[PDB]
Protein backbone atom coordinates (compact mmCIF):
# COMPACT_ATOMS: atom_id res chain seq x y z
CA UNK A 1 0.00 0.00 0.00
CA UNK A 2 0.91 3.67 -0.08
CA UNK A 3 -0.89 5.86 2.40
CA UNK A 4 1.13 8.93 1.31
CA UNK A 5 -1.06 11.80 0.19
CA UNK A 6 -2.99 14.91 1.17
CA UNK A 7 -6.34 13.57 2.34
CA UNK A 8 -9.57 15.58 2.60
CA UNK A 9 -12.54 14.46 4.72
CA UNK A 10 -15.81 13.61 2.94
CA UNK A 11 -17.74 11.90 5.74
CA UNK A 12 -17.64 11.60 9.52
CA UNK A 13 -19.95 9.47 11.66
CA UNK A 14 -20.38 8.94 15.41
CA UNK A 15 -17.79 11.54 16.40
CA UNK A 16 -20.09 13.25 18.88
CA UNK A 17 -20.86 9.92 20.57
CA UNK A 18 -17.13 9.21 20.87
CA UNK A 19 -16.53 12.56 22.59
CA UNK A 20 -19.43 11.92 24.97
CA UNK A 21 -17.81 8.63 26.06
CA UNK A 22 -14.68 10.69 26.67
CA UNK A 23 -16.54 13.09 28.98
CA UNK A 24 -16.68 16.16 26.73
CA UNK A 25 -19.64 18.39 27.59
CA UNK A 26 -22.37 19.08 25.05
CA UNK A 27 -21.48 22.53 23.71
CA UNK A 28 -17.83 21.64 23.17
CA UNK A 29 -18.86 18.36 21.51
CA UNK A 30 -20.89 20.28 18.91
CA UNK A 31 -18.08 22.77 18.32
CA UNK A 32 -15.66 19.87 17.91
CA UNK A 33 -17.94 18.08 15.44
CA UNK A 34 -17.96 21.29 13.41
CA UNK A 35 -14.16 21.42 13.57
CA UNK A 36 -13.92 17.81 12.33
CA UNK A 37 -15.62 18.90 9.10
CA UNK A 38 -12.35 20.65 8.17
CA UNK A 39 -10.24 17.70 9.29
CA UNK A 40 -7.34 17.08 6.88
CA UNK A 41 -4.64 14.39 7.02
CA UNK A 42 -1.25 14.59 5.32
CA UNK A 43 0.67 11.30 5.25
CA UNK A 44 4.20 10.48 4.13
CA UNK A 45 5.00 6.75 4.22
CA UNK A 46 8.50 5.30 3.72
CA UNK A 47 8.31 1.55 4.23
CA UNK A 48 6.77 1.05 7.66
CA UNK A 49 7.77 4.55 8.85
CA UNK A 50 4.91 7.06 8.87
CA UNK A 51 4.86 10.84 9.14
CA UNK A 52 1.28 12.07 9.65
CA UNK A 53 0.11 15.67 10.04
CA UNK A 54 -3.46 16.03 11.33
CA UNK A 55 -5.02 19.48 11.16
CA UNK A 56 -8.19 21.51 11.42
CA UNK A 57 -8.78 25.22 10.78
CA UNK A 58 -6.90 26.40 13.88
CA UNK A 59 -4.89 23.37 15.05
CA UNK A 60 -2.26 21.00 13.66
CA UNK A 61 -0.32 18.08 15.15
CA UNK A 62 2.33 15.71 13.84
CA UNK A 63 2.41 11.98 14.65
CA UNK A 64 5.55 10.08 13.63
CA UNK A 65 5.84 6.36 14.21
CA UNK A 66 7.30 3.14 12.87
CA UNK A 67 5.10 0.06 12.79
CA UNK A 68 5.81 -2.19 15.74
CA UNK A 69 7.71 0.30 17.90
CA UNK A 70 6.17 2.12 20.81
CA UNK A 71 5.73 5.88 20.73
CA UNK A 72 3.97 8.59 22.71
CA UNK A 73 1.08 10.65 21.40
CA UNK A 74 -2.25 11.78 22.87
CA UNK A 75 -5.75 10.34 22.94
CA UNK A 76 -8.62 12.08 21.16
CA UNK A 77 -9.60 14.02 24.28
CA UNK A 78 -5.99 15.08 24.80
CA UNK A 79 -4.47 12.85 27.45
CA UNK A 80 -0.89 11.61 26.84
CA UNK A 81 -0.56 7.94 25.95
CA UNK A 82 1.83 5.25 24.78
CA UNK A 83 0.91 3.74 21.43
CA UNK A 84 1.81 0.74 19.30
CA UNK A 85 0.79 0.29 15.66
CA UNK A 86 0.49 -3.09 13.92
CA UNK A 87 -0.67 -4.21 10.50
CA UNK A 88 -3.99 -6.06 10.30
CA UNK A 89 -3.64 -6.75 6.56
CA UNK A 90 -1.95 -5.28 3.52
CA UNK A 91 -3.86 -1.98 3.66
CA UNK A 92 -4.99 -1.64 7.31
CA UNK A 93 -3.12 -0.70 10.50
CA UNK A 94 -4.38 -0.67 14.09
CA UNK A 95 -3.03 1.30 17.01
CA UNK A 96 -3.54 0.36 20.66
CA UNK A 97 -3.20 3.09 23.28
CA UNK A 98 -2.66 2.96 27.03
CA UNK A 99 -2.87 6.04 29.23
CA UNK A 100 0.41 7.34 30.65
CA UNK A 101 -1.26 8.31 33.95
CA UNK A 102 -4.64 7.65 35.49
CA UNK A 103 -7.67 5.77 34.25
CA UNK A 104 -10.04 6.16 31.33
CA UNK A 105 -11.83 4.31 28.54
CA UNK A 106 -9.85 1.99 26.29
CA UNK A 107 -8.95 3.93 23.14
CA UNK A 108 -7.47 2.95 19.77
CA UNK A 109 -7.51 3.97 16.12
CA UNK A 110 -7.24 2.38 12.69
CA UNK A 111 -6.29 3.55 9.21
CA UNK A 112 -7.24 1.67 6.06
CA UNK A 113 -6.68 2.19 2.33
CA UNK A 114 -9.71 0.93 0.40
CA UNK A 115 -9.64 -0.53 -3.09
CA UNK A 116 -11.70 2.50 -4.21
CA UNK A 117 -8.98 5.04 -3.37
CA UNK A 118 -10.46 6.16 -0.05
CA UNK A 119 -8.75 6.44 3.34
CA UNK A 120 -10.88 5.21 6.23
CA UNK A 121 -9.90 6.26 9.75
CA UNK A 122 -11.66 4.90 12.81
CA UNK A 123 -11.32 6.00 16.41
CA UNK A 124 -12.68 3.91 19.27
CA UNK A 125 -13.46 4.56 22.92
CA UNK A 126 -14.88 1.56 24.78
CA UNK A 127 -17.39 0.25 22.26
CA UNK A 128 -18.23 3.49 20.45
CA UNK A 129 -16.52 3.67 17.05
CA UNK A 130 -16.13 6.90 15.05
CA UNK A 131 -15.57 6.45 11.31
CA UNK A 132 -14.09 9.14 9.05
CA UNK A 133 -13.68 8.82 5.28
CA UNK A 134 -11.21 10.80 3.18
CA UNK A 135 -10.26 11.25 -0.46
CA UNK A 136 -7.08 12.56 -2.02
CA UNK A 137 -6.96 16.31 -2.55
C1 LIG B 1 -3.80 8.00 12.03
C2 LIG B 1 -4.60 9.08 12.54
C3 LIG B 1 -4.51 9.70 13.74
C4 LIG B 1 -3.51 9.33 14.81
C5 LIG B 1 -5.43 10.78 14.01
C6 LIG B 1 -5.74 11.36 15.17
C7 LIG B 1 -6.72 12.39 15.17
C8 LIG B 1 -7.22 13.10 16.21
C9 LIG B 1 -6.78 12.91 17.64
C10 LIG B 1 -8.22 14.08 15.93
C11 LIG B 1 -8.84 14.88 16.74
C12 LIG B 1 -9.86 15.88 16.48
C13 LIG B 1 -10.37 16.58 17.51
C14 LIG B 1 -10.21 16.19 18.95
C15 LIG B 1 -11.12 17.87 17.32
C16 LIG B 1 -10.99 18.44 15.92
C17 LIG B 1 -11.21 17.34 14.90
C18 LIG B 1 -10.20 16.20 15.01
C19 LIG B 1 -10.81 14.99 14.30
C20 LIG B 1 -8.95 16.66 14.24
UniProtKB/Swiss-Prot annotation:
It comes from the Eukaryota. One of its GO terms (cellular component) is cytoplasm. One of its GO terms (biological process) is retinoic acid metabolic process. A motif (Nuclear localization signal) lies at residues 20-30. Induction: By retinoic acid. Its main location: cytoplasm. The keyword Transcription regulation does not apply. One of its GO terms (molecular function) is retinoid binding. There is a cross-link at residue 101 (Glycyl lysine isopeptide (Lys-Gly) (interchain with G-Cter in SUMO)). The keyword Coiled coil does not apply. Changing residue 30 to A: Loss of ligand-induced nuclear import. Changing residue 29 to A: Loss of ligand-induced nuclear import. Keywords: Cytoplasm, Endoplasmic reticulum, Isopeptide bond, Nucleus, Retinol-binding, Transport, Ubl conjugation, Vitamin A. Belongs to the calycin superfamily. Fatty-acid binding protein (FABP) family. Transports retinoic acid to the nucleus. Regulates the access of retinoic acid to the nuclear retinoic acid receptors. Interacts with RXR and RARA. Interacts with importin alpha. Forms a beta-barrel structure that accommodates hydrophobic ligands in its interior. This is Cellular retinoic acid-binding protein 2. It comes from Homo sapiens (Human).
